[PDB]
UniProtKB/Swiss-Prot annotation:
Organism of this sequence: Helicobacter pylori (Campylobacter pylori)
Domain of life of the native organism: Bacteria
Name of the gene: vacA
Role played: Induces vacuolation of eukaryotic cells. Causes ulceration and gastric lesions.
Keywords: Cell outer membrane, Membrane, Periplasm, Secreted, Signal, Toxin, Transmembrane, Transmembrane beta strand, Virulence
Ranges annotated as spanning the membrane: none
Organism placement in taxonomy: Bacteria, Pseudomonadati, Campylobacterota, Epsilonproteobacteria, Campylobacterales
Name of protein: Vacuolating cytotoxin autotransporter
UniProt comment concerning the protein's domains: The signal peptide, cleaved at the inner membrane, guides the autotransporter protein to the periplasmic space. Then, insertion of the C-terminal translocator domain in the outer membrane forms a hydrophilic pore for the translocation of the passenger domain to the bacterial cell surface, with subsequent cleavage.
Length: 750
């Protein structure tokens, strides 16, 4: 209810105590010349002025200083050389030790653990236990502010432990450091490397699951290499731990609880530093920004999730104000009970670089039920709004898992959610871009305001409907997809598909049709295609494909493949730029193409040297069985508005609008152009006579000499190119005479 940011900021600025009977013990002669003796420190020195006892009410042991828990002692060695150990000081209430041991190796555990506790008196005192050794070498467990016995008797107040070596504070493998509700820990050596279970926050009493349970490991002075190995926050409560580190914190396995917080705080930029009565200035801290090179290399985040069921999740969280939060190859795990647990990997003023697989219940897919909506959550650069959330590993989300990223530029490498479905892939906090490299979706709730996803997969989702890709917010102006690839649905029902809600354009390069997956393109008015527009079954189309548009505008060189096997349904303005649309019959008849309001076009002298003519602007290929003497409606339209770079047509000239558009269309059948036959030599006369079925152009190419720098339009083939209809009237494959007529010239603008 208070929060850790108040608690540590009020406990860091305190006077220690006011104790009477300041005992002073100096280790005189005898100690300071045996460098390897392996002394004891309790029995040989400290037991003179530390008396044991028994508390009537839940005692195991009971230690204080002398005549109560309000008496300071001190030990002033400063030259005692050797190696010392505590080895069994349990339930030490005491108060105000400081064992000043220069050039003396400590060992704070051997065959038995240690404990440092206080009592909740009417004075509300701390302990302020200090040490000043050279190495420390913990080597067995230490419980700071533990429970004394079991519940009853006197309760435990706060404490402070300070370990101030000058060569390293290491630890052994089985040294469980477990600091509790009121405990802190200050370290000041170089290269802390705790290779054991650090346990911030624990059940202090037997059933109190609703304790606040704060803690602090203030490793502020550590000039070397902080290295945890196994950090574990919280146990059956809402623990809010905090580590004020020294801007380089490699840890190992992190094991949060369901409702466990973590406030890793990097240092600032320049580093740290009847009668009235005046309390001292209680300087408080706000959430500030870390320095430049502040790195927190947490390499595995698990979560222990069991217990009760609440109306939501429980929102495990960690909060870091460092300039980087690298998460390595261990990735993210999340245990899941019946309600969907929630992980909040927050960053205040930095970046997030996750390089691992987002697991849940310790597998990559991780299916979850409907009431279990697992909520991954990332906040990269909140208070400065210029932080990227780069996920350099190909993530994979199963069913009922809800990623949300609220950053500046959420880069990715691949998102794969088509396996599970029902995934809220939120991106609502994104400032500008979400640069996804690969996408797999079945029934998703994507909400991106601006992006460029250069690969897209439109999956189906069984036979049920109401399950679809849903871009449920505005797509904006700078949006882009560089590849859309629909895959084949299921027979007789449009199960899966893609629908939008808003936006104005999305520059697509390549697209694929599919049987029974609908590409609904609601409300977006400039759906642009730039290259090939094919089907996912490219040589054998079938089925239907609802391309339920509201506008499009196709640009340069983008070939289309429109048949009866793809009901391309336009409710808007099919506009074509210099793009070569291809057709096909699949049964001798051409499917019409419905332009909603206007098909206004504009071109140039799009001449090539492969043919000598212009590029064939609208082609009807694979019309080998095209029915002669029959109107085949190519497209039903309202305005065929031709243009070029001027109003006058055929490149740049003053020619009228529609009659030359019969020239730029082509009928490519029998593997050559049969509408016109554009000729620059004698070699293509062979294939031209193969196209029109005449041996007068096959056996002798020099029989017809009207075609050196010229061409000829085939009589018996008529087309419309006026302002209301384009229809092709294939009614004759007639043999052209040599010098009688029906001949055309070359453009020749090169």
């Amino acid at each position: 209810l208070l929060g850790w940011g108040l608690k540590q900021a009020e406990e860091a600025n305190k006077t220690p105590d006011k104790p009477d009977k300041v005992w002073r013990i100096q280790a005189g002669k005898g100690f300071n010349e045996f460098p390897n003796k392996e002394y004891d420190l309790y029995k040989s020195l400290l037991s003179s002025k530390i008396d044991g006892g028994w508390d009537w009410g839940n005692a195991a042991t009971h230690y204080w200083i002398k005549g109560g828990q309000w008496n300071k002692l001190e030990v002033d060695m400063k030259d005692a050389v050797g190696t010392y150990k505590l080895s069994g000081l349990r339930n030490f209430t005491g108060g105000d030790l400081d064992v000043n041991m220069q050039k003396a190796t400590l060992r704070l555990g051997q065959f038995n653990g240690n404990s440092f506790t206080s009592y909740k008196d009417s004075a509300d005192r701390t302990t302020r236990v200090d040490f000043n050794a050279k190495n420390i070498l913990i080597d067995n467990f230490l419980e700071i502010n533990n429970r004394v016995g079991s519940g009853a008797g006197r309760k435990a107040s706060s404490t402070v432990l300070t370990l101030q070596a000058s060569e390293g504070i290491t630890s052994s493998k089985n040294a469980e450091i477990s600091l509790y509700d009121g405990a802190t820990l200050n370290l000041a050596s170089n290269s802390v490397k705790l290779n054991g279970n650090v346990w911030m926050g624990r059940l202090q009493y037997v059933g109190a699951y609703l304790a606040p349970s704060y803690s602090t490991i203030n490793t502020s002075k550590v000039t070397g290499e902080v290295n945890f190995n196994h950090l574990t926050v919280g146990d059956h409560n809402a623990a809010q731990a905090g580590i004020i580190a020294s801007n380089k914190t490699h840890i190992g396995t992190l094991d949060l609880w369901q409702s466990a917080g973590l406030n890793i705080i990097a240092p600032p930029e320049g580093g740290y530093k009847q009668k009235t009565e005046v309390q001292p200035t209680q300087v408080i801290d706000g959430p500030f920004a870390g320095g430049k090179d502040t790195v927190v290399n947490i390499d595995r985040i698990n979560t222990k999730a069991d217990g009760t069921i609440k109306v939501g999740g429980f929102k495990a969280s960690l909060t870091t104000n460092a300039a980087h939060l690298n998460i390595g190859k261990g990735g993210v795990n999340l245990s899941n009970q019946a309600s969907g647990r929630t992980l909040l990997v927050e960053n205040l003023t930095g970046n997030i670089t996750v390089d691992g697989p987002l697991r849940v219940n310790n597998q990559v897919g991780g299916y979850a039920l409907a009431g279990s909506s697992a909520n991954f959550e990332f906040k990269a650069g909140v208070d400065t709004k210029n932080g990227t959330a780069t996920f350099n590993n190909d993530i994979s989300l199963g069913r009922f898992v809800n990623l949300k990223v609220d950053a500046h530029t959420a880069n990715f490498k691949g998102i794969d959610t088509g396996n599970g479905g029902f995934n809220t892939l939120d991106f609502s906090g994104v400032t500008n871009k979400v640069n996804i490299n690969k996408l797999i979706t079945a029934s998703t709730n994507v909400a991106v305001k601006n992006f460029n996803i250069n690969e897209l997969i439109v999956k189906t989702n069984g036979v049920s409907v109401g399950e679809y890709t849903h871009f449920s917010e505005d797509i904006g102006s700078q949006s882009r997809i560089n590849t859309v690839r629909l895959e084949t649905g299921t027979r007789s029902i449009f199960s899966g598909g893609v629908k939008f809600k808003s936006g104005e354009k999305l520059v697509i390069d390549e697209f694929y049709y599919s049987p029974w997956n609908y590409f609904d393109a609601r409300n977006i008015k400039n759906v642009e295609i730039t290259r090939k527009f094919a089907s996912s079954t490219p040589e054998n189309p079938w089925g239907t494909s609802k391309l339920m548009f509201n506008n499009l505008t196709l640009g340069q060189n983008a070939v289309m493949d429109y048949s009866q096997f793809s009901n391309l349904t336009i409710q808007g303005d099919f506009i074509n730029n210099q793009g070569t649309i291809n057709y096909l019959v699949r049964g001798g008849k051409v499917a019409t193409l419905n332009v909603g309001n206007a098909a206004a076009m504009m071109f140039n002298n799009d001449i090539d040297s492969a043919t000598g003519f212009y590029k064939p602007l609208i082609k009807i290929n694979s019309a080998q069985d095209l029915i002669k003497n029959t109107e085949h409606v190519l497209l039903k339209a309202k305005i065929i508005g031709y243009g070029n770079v001027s109003t006058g047509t055929n490149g740049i000239s003053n020619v009228n609008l529609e009659e030359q558009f019969k020239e730029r269309l082509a009928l490519y059948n029998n593997n050559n152009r049969m509408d016109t036959c554009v000729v620059r030599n004698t070699d293509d006369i062979k294939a031209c006579g193969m196209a029109i079925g005449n041996q007068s152009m096959v056996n002798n190419p020099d029989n017809y000499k009207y075609l050196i720098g010229k061409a000829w339009k085939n009589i018996g083939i008529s087309k419309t190119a006026n302002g209301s209809k384009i229809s092709v009237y294939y009614l004759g494959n007639s043999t052209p005479t040599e010098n009688g007529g029906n001949t055309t010239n070359l453009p020749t603008n090169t």
